[PDB]
Design an enzyme around this catalytic site. Structure first.
Site, PDB file in Angstrom:
ATOM      1  N   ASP A  44       0.107   4.815   0.503  1.00 56.12           N
ATOM      2  CA  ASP A  44      -0.819   6.105   0.908  1.00 56.12           C
ATOM      3  C   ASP A  44      -0.057   7.657   0.471  1.00 56.12           C
ATOM      4  OD1 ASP A  44      -2.429   4.320   2.181  1.00 56.12           O
ATOM      5  OD2 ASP A  44      -1.229   4.498   3.954  1.00 56.12           O
ATOM      6  N   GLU A  64       0.794  -1.211   0.153  1.00 51.14           N
ATOM      7  CA  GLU A  64      -0.116  -0.044   0.096  1.00 51.14           C
ATOM      8  C   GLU A  64       0.737   1.412   0.018  1.00 51.14           C
ATOM      9  OE1 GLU A  64      -2.696   0.160   3.160  1.00 51.14           O
ATOM     10  OE2 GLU A  64      -3.215   2.161   3.061  1.00 51.14           O
ATOM     11  N   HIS A 102       3.772   1.563   2.788  1.00 47.57           N
ATOM     12  CA  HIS A 102       3.662   0.206   3.363  1.00 47.57           C
ATOM     13  C   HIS A 102       4.107  -0.906   2.598  1.00 47.57           C
ATOM     14  CE1 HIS A 102       0.814   1.855   6.329  1.00 47.57           C
ATOM     15  NE2 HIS A 102       0.378   2.726   5.517  1.00 47.57           N
ATOM     16  N   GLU A 153      -3.769  10.702   3.596  1.00 44.58           N
ATOM     17  CA  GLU A 153      -4.722  10.368   4.296  1.00 44.58           C
ATOM     18  C   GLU A 153      -4.862  11.799   5.233  1.00 44.58           C
ATOM     19  OE1 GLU A 153      -5.538   7.056   5.403  1.00 44.58           O
ATOM     20  OE2 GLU A 153      -4.373   6.226   3.550  1.00 44.58           O
TER      21      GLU A 153
END
Length: 442
Positions: free
Chosen positions: A216, A214, A230, A219
């Site tokens: 990001d 992942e 991640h 956020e």
């Protein structure tokens, strides 16, 4: 999942731009599909719900295999996008309403390619990804997120023949949290040992989780924002059970296949509290729209190099705004994600560097090289009330201890039952998406 026959699936058209040089872009006629969790699940040859509220029907779904045989997910027609799910498009802008009143709470969606049969896969190494965002109506406890995950382009259809819908029905979701709340995993209902989540009338957790890498990009709400890598070992979609999921509840957060914390650059947490916030004297004013630019730098400046750096800058009302910097005594003033930044900041914060354990920026890059699916979502947080993003985490921690304070929100904020009333009309907008070589999108 089988596909139901009650309603045609009609994704929302969303054009993006693919660019070769600054102001030289061409339209790519993509579309937005709703995640399969939000779909009506009913009997294959009828109208009877297989899932209602936060429970599977035990007669129809005594086992996952029987559930999968008996049940099907159905389409989202155009009228239902706004009326039921709170999704709409105007030109190149996509809007997601948090609560839509029969009452829908949050949404997760994916970008389809121009055929509308596969996710638009982005090979992000040595590229720049850019979009305009409005999070002015999102306050403490809410998150309007834009991110990439290592889903399969067909949602797993080729791997799992019981998955009849594929990307067309928003199937195959996985992320670095290895979530058990995904209703369909590896082509099967995740109905074994299904447990409702208390205080969440729509959601539960099944036996399996679904893991994958992942990235990001965003956020955020109007109070705090973060970008985070991640990696997982491996990066690709992996159904998990037991310790491999790295479940929080069994003390396994750091024992699983994915880096759950990720390596984050969050301006406020990095000790610049004046960079981003809801007002004109913050450097970046979250009460107004702005452009978010992300550059994925490799070791040799080519598509074949290892991922080495996630760079970030912003544009607001024509004003270029460089990223904030890490601001602690004796720590280098990093303004990007690198392996060194991750080691130094996690060292300071006393956070376990699971990012490094999972192969670091290089491993994150391998996911990005294979291609990742774009996710756009709006959600509240039934586990941790978004305190990790926008408050003190842990809530009992001293806010002067580096790493604890992530935003100005009170530690009592973000209770889903409260935010679902108080912020019912919150809407995140993502628009004017642009993708191309480094330096090409503004």
């Amino acid at each position: 999942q089988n596909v139901g026959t009650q309603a045609a699936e009609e994704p929302l058209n969303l054009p993006i731009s693919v660019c070769t040089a600054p102001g030289n872009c061409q339209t790519e006629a993509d579309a937005v599909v709703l995640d399969s969790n939000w779909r009506w699940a009913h009997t294959t040859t009828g109208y009877t719900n297989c899932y209602t509220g936060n429970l599977w029907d035990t007669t129809l779904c005594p086992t996952p295999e029987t559930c999968t045989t008996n049940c099907a997910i159905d389409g989202v027609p155009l009228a239902d996008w706004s009326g039921t799910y709170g999704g709409s498009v105007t030109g190149n802008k996509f809007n997601l309403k948090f609560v839509t009143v029969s009452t829908n709470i949050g949404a997760r969606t994916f970008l389809l390619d121009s055929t509308k049969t596969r996710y638009r896969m982005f090979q992000l190494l040595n590229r720049e990804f850019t979009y305009d965002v409005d999070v002015s109506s999102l306050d403490c406890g809410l998150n309007g997120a834009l991110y990439f995950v290592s889903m399969d382009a067909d949602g797993g259809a080729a791997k799992y023949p019981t998955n009849k819908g594929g990307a067309k029905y928003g199937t195959g979701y996985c992320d670095a949290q290895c979530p058990h709340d995904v209703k369909w995993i590896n082509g099967l209902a995740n109905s074994k040992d299904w447990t409702p989540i208390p205080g969440d009338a729509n959601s539960g957790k099944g036996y399996y989780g679904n893991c994958c890498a992942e990235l990001d990009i965003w956020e955020a709400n109007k109070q705090s924002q973060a970008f985070t890598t991640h990696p997982c070992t491996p990066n690709d979609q992996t159904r998990c059970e037991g310790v491999v999921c790295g479940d929080n509840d069994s003390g396994d957060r750091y024992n699983g296949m994915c880096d759950k914390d990720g390596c984050d650059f969050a301006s406020y947490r990095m000790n610049d509290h004046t960079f981003y916030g809801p007002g004109s004297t913050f450097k970046l004013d979250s009460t107004k729209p702005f452009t978010v630019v992300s550059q994925f730098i490799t070791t040799d400046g080519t598509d074949n190099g290892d991922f080495k750096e996630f760079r970030r800058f912003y544009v607001q009302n024509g004003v270029r705004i460089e990223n904030s910097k890490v601001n602690f005594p004796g720590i280098t003033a990093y303004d990007s994600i690198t392996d060194e930044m991750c080691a130094a900041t996690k060292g300071l914060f006393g956070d376990l560097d699971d990012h490094k354990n999972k192969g670091g920026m290089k491993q994150m890059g391998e996911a990005m090289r294979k291609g990742m699916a774009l996710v756009m979502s709006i959600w509240d947080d039934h586990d941790v009330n978004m305190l990790w993003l926008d408050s003190n985490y842990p809530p009992t921690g001293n806010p002067s201890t580096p790493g604890v304070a992530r935003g100005p929100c009170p530690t009592t904020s973000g209770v889903p039952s409260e935010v679902e009333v108080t912020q019912a009309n919150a809407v995140v907008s993502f628009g004017n998406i642009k993708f191309g070589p480094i330096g090409s999108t503004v």
